[PDB]
Structure 1
């Protein structure tokens, strides 16, 4: 079998060979077994919103042409897309809500394992929300910030402040004029579910305006999530670590943290250090915490925990035979891991009441009992490592060097070595003179339909040669880190002369043997909000709105409903937004035209749907260069 058609990651290819000869079914095998997939669903032309269904519409030809209730293709497509945005919003904001309750508990004395770690961040958030700090205790400031976070989930006298206080006033003004500012995060999710139910909203433009507003609720959830985690766990600064399956170690207890919420994994990290000697006694060198998906990104950014794999290839960590435990909370966890665990000997542990997997061991995690629960979990991992004594494992000897931890604050600090009191100016200077063509954010997942990482790396390589400053989050950062894009030793090979000069100048001014890495890792998926903060700060420094800046986003291999919500709010805040996988919209030309074209007249952003990555790179460059020409810059 040609494993490079499944993944461009050589360590993943090696594990696919091992899974094949051991007879362990993979996500790629389940994909093959699903082909050919349903064309009504692929195009968006299916509706199950009531029990008169299921209804479908032929993309071309004869009947059925319309849903049983009269719903058109346009309504059906818009309604399905709207529910996906609401679902993504519900995940990101459920993540943030957990962080909000955790911060509240922490400063109320209910969970001593948690504390205010970043006082500076606490105060800057309180100030941005209009929460007075002068004369207040940190605990009381934090209490107020947690209360404001929870208040943004419902209607109140103010709109969602994690939208209106994080975007430039001019952007908020154009969104308010279209009625797009969310009134409450869960309020908007519920309204989507209402308006998309049978016999309700049946106008594509009305429905899609609702989706834009719900995407801003998703953005608020992301930004709140990043804010609260930085308070609780620290704002990331530049770190050095490694990535890919070669970060596992046969002689250690290998513990993957997988899912999204750092309330769990940050505790695993610190507790695993406390139990090192208990692990030495079981015959291990120690506990080797490694990261998968966003929760791994979280502990990579803050602690330098090596990333072992991401997204579509998550099963391959287990296939090595050396993964003793996989500790889960929620989101983007293939449920197959619970059945594969029986073949690989991995102990799979769920921790969240609303995210169980049949066959997995459930260990309830309560923030009030975080250390005790973590030790109960890590002891299951040690028992498992003992059980594989004298078993051979196959860990591919494949890893990359990863410089990461580029929070927006860290980026501002790095630039400040070139201009202390105007740190954004050196970046803008080099945009203006052409050393930086523009900025591209890579975000989102892998998708089994796309050879793993192929779009991310193909697009990134073209952009970097054209002097684009590339930043990345989530499993887009995962793809780029696993292929060397976060190793500064690759600046010469990857970057155009102008971008190299800039990365080198900044790196030299920060006391480094050389340049920043080719791609700046800005964090998890909620940390797409960091890219927003940076671009908003650039917008404010220049006196223009985001839809005039040479900034684009690419969800190059998108999968999750969360990635659709992110892409939609990237469009809503004004960015040309590439998506490298077909969302289910092509069954409706009017919807596609709204999302790819007429939405420009509303928010200035627009979707770029392009499945061929070389073509996508050209379209993203043209989008960047059209912005440059709109600022009167050469390009």
Structure 2
């Protein structure tokens, strides 16, 4: 089972699933081999009913699509649509938060409020919204109106792009026409230009893709901004991760999906309901996280993370998961079928994300506390049905220090230099205690033994004194393998990096270092890494493509992740991906993404499937940036 997942708790559940005849994601993957080579290389098109069209990667006919579309056009069009779909997911998440803030501040949803008024004011200041003499509710209404305005064309471009990157970067992008005009505007234009008989120039198509990826960045950044206003900016927290955070004697309730508008309410309400749960024979309600909505409530509330991404079915296989509360994105629909075997109550809550066979509760912000209680009462009922059943919770968990928002990282650094908090970080970059910065982002992927790329790459970078930050299921992989436990700094970290983590941690009243990896939050919270990197660039007086900063989507899967990696390249970062998207069928497209995009944005993709080799290439990328700044390496 270690060929399927490197996580020991997942291996134990895989053994249980096998002997109980419950099919898993890995079984369905095995039933799919050999996968289609046309799809895997990107040489397939179904964008009109003369198709499906395919192109042999090598050999004889077919060489060209029926309408005349070349390999490079078909590949670029497919890639553009996956960026647009990713932008649509991140932007829908942000849009739903914008409506929630608007309703809260108009008195239409009393369960929601301005929890971080400091964040509210700095955002409004960044957007040019005046704050002096204004009520908080009026400022917030202006912020929510500005968020919603960025989805369509207006007299300004998308402000959640132009006000969050350095002016030099914005200018490089405006020069190439890459600034989005409206988030949903760019999504629709991608679908238009990629439909039959429209854009048929690989470079033109890919430039549209870079622009749409910046619409995705804007949705991520807007999502992080609005969630922090509504639910609070994360600060350092201590919790646990992996399946052992389930408790047989408690009502175990997983929050799963991406948007915390739902799950943050669940967290608060479940505390009100401890007495209901005890009445049923539980010790209490044990809310745990799966995927990014789990990351959200982990970052803000210390809710323990149960599992992530590809292994999400195994939380149910324990037999102890009484409810799984879903909003949208990255939910394997198999959970609705597996629930018939495991007893779990799977509950959908969003109108546009239902699963056949799951119970649906029509969540509304106006009725959030009522809905939470209805859902949690179903979880209580499910616990009573299993009172007296054996469960198999693997007794495996790690300690997780997390909550490292960019504001938290600044604050932590400020204990070393109050009025110039970025300087201690840059000092240790310059003197070599910090070789560079690597962000791990994105999903797990059944194609890759779970967590194997994240941990292998992280281990080599940390020994080489790279400061490693992480989001999404990359944070989940690293967290479940001990990389967020400061007790592992001695084992994992090079001497220079250990010295820096120790200095910062000691100055922050901790008695020990910061953890080996800094957890920056959910997938939209990749925007926090952008805020940190832009602040470093501004403090250094250079553009982002001169910083020793790289990204690694080491095991990615989702269209959202494809978009993130694309905007990481567009804002100037060398960006490793550990699973190839369907692009190898066009050498010209591959050359653009790995080489010539350098001349447009200064970033570039690093395609490398072997993780030890990927780590070497990321180190080389970091060290080239170091040399370009005149630094030793």
TM-score by length of 1: 1.00
The offset of 1:526, in angstroms, is 0.1
Match of 2:81 in 1: 83
Residues 124-157 of structure 1 deviation map (CA, whole Å, 9 limit, x = unaligned): 0000000000000000000000000000000000
**Alpha-carbon deviation of 1:213?**
0.1
Q: Deviations over 1:44-82 (max 9, x none)?
A: 000000000000000000000000000000000000000
Q: State the secondary structure of the residue aligned to 1:349.
A: strand
1:236 shift after superposition: 0.1
Question: 1:411: Cα distance to partner?
Answer: 0.1
SS in 1 for 2:555: coil
Measure, in 2, the Cα distance between the counterparts of 1:193 and 1:274.
46
**Deviation of residue 450 (structure 1)?**
0.1
Q: Distance in 2 between matches of 1:364 and 1:320?
A: 28
Residue deviations 1:213-258 (CA, integer Å, cap 9, x gap):
0000000000000000000000000000000000000000000000
C-alpha distance after superposition, 1:78-132 (max 9, x if no partner): 0000000000000000000000000000000000000000000000000000000
**1: distance between equivalents of 2:247 and 2:367?**
29
Question: SS where residue 173 of structure 2 aligns?
Answer: helix
C-alpha displacement at 1:513, in angstroms? 1.2
Report the alpha carbon displacement of residue 272 of structure 1 after superposing the two structures with TM. 0.3
Match of 1:146 among 144, 147, 165: 144
* Counterpart-to-counterpart distance in 2, 1:477 and 1:291: 13
The DSSP-based 3-state class of the residue aligned with 1:582 is: coil
Instruction: Say whether residues 1:420 and 2:418 are aligned partners.
Output: yes
Over residues 250-302 of structure 1, what are the superposed CA-to-partner deviations in whole Å (9 max), with x where a residue is unaligned? 00000000000000000000000000000000000000000000000000000
Map residues 149-548 of structure 1 onto 2, 5 A cutoff.
149-548=147-546
Shift of 1:551: 0.1
Tell me, in whole angstroms, the C-alpha distance in 2 between the residues paired with 1:475 and 1:386.
32
1:552-604 Cα distance to aligned partner (Å, 9 max, x none): 00000000000000000000000000000011000000000000000000000
Q: 1:633: Cα distance to partner?
A: 0.2
Secondary structure, aligned partner of 2:312: helix
Q: Secondary structure at the match of 1:249?
A: coil
CA distance, structure 1, for counterparts of residue 479 and residue 137 of structure 2: 38
Q: CA deviation at 1:409?
A: 0.2
Q: Distance in 2 between matches of 1:206 and 1:519?
A: 39
1:29 maps to 2:39: no
> C-alpha separation between the residues in 2 aligned to 1:16 and 1:268?
29
- List alignment gaps of at least 5 residues for structure 1: none
Partner of 1:40: 38
Distance 1:593 1:134 in 2: 51
1:535: Cα distance to partner?
A: 0.2
User: Structure 2 CA distance, aligned partners of 1:514 and 1:251?
Assistant: 34
Alpha-carbon distance between aligned partners in 2 of 1:128 and 1:389, rounded to the nearest angstrom: 54
Deviation (angstroms), 1:331: 0.2
For residues 148 and 6 of structure 2, the distance between their equivalents in structure 1, rounded to whole angstroms, comes to 42
Tell me the TM-score normalised to structure 2 length: 1.00
Counterpart-to-counterpart distance in 2, 1:95 and 1:611: 31
Distance, in Å, in 1 between the alignment partners of 2:288 and 2:535 is 33
Mapped to 2, the partners of 1:51 and 1:368 lie a distance apart of 44
Deviation string, structure 1 residues 509-545 (Cα, Å, up to 9, x no partner)? 0011110000000000000000000000000000000
- SS of the residue corresponding to residue 180 of structure 1 reads coil
Tell me how far apart the structure 1 counterparts of residues 63 and 365 of structure 2 sit (CA, whole Å): 53
Partner of 2:135: 137
C-alpha separation in 2, matches of 1:314 and 1:363: 21
Q: For residue 615 of structure 1, what is the aligned residue in structure 2?
A: 613
Count of residues in correspondence between the two structures:
633
1:298-341 Cα shifts (integer Å, max 9, x gaps) = 00000000000000000000000000000000000000000000
SS of 1:435 mapped into structure 2: coil
Q: 1:405 offset after TM fit, Å? A: 0.1
Give the secondary-structure state (helix, strand or coil) at the position aligned to 1:198. Answer: coil
Q: Distance in 1 between matches of 2:511 and 2:37?
A: 54
Provide the rounded CA distance (Å) in 2 between the counterparts of 1:600 and 1:582: 19
The runs of at least 4 aligned residues of structure 1 exceeding 4 Å deviation read none
What is the rounded CA distance, in whole Å, between the counterparts of 1:451 and 1:630 in structure 2? 36
CA distance in 2, matches of 1:474, 1:514: 26
Provide the secondary structure at the position in 1 that maps to 2:534: helix
User: Which digits, 9 at most, give the CA deviation of each residue in 1:398-441, with x for residues without a partner?
Assistant: 00000000000000000000000000000000000000000000
CA distance in 1, matches of 2:569, 2:606: 10
Partner SS for 2:325: strand
> What RMSD, in angstroms, separates the aligned Cα atoms of the two structures?
0.2
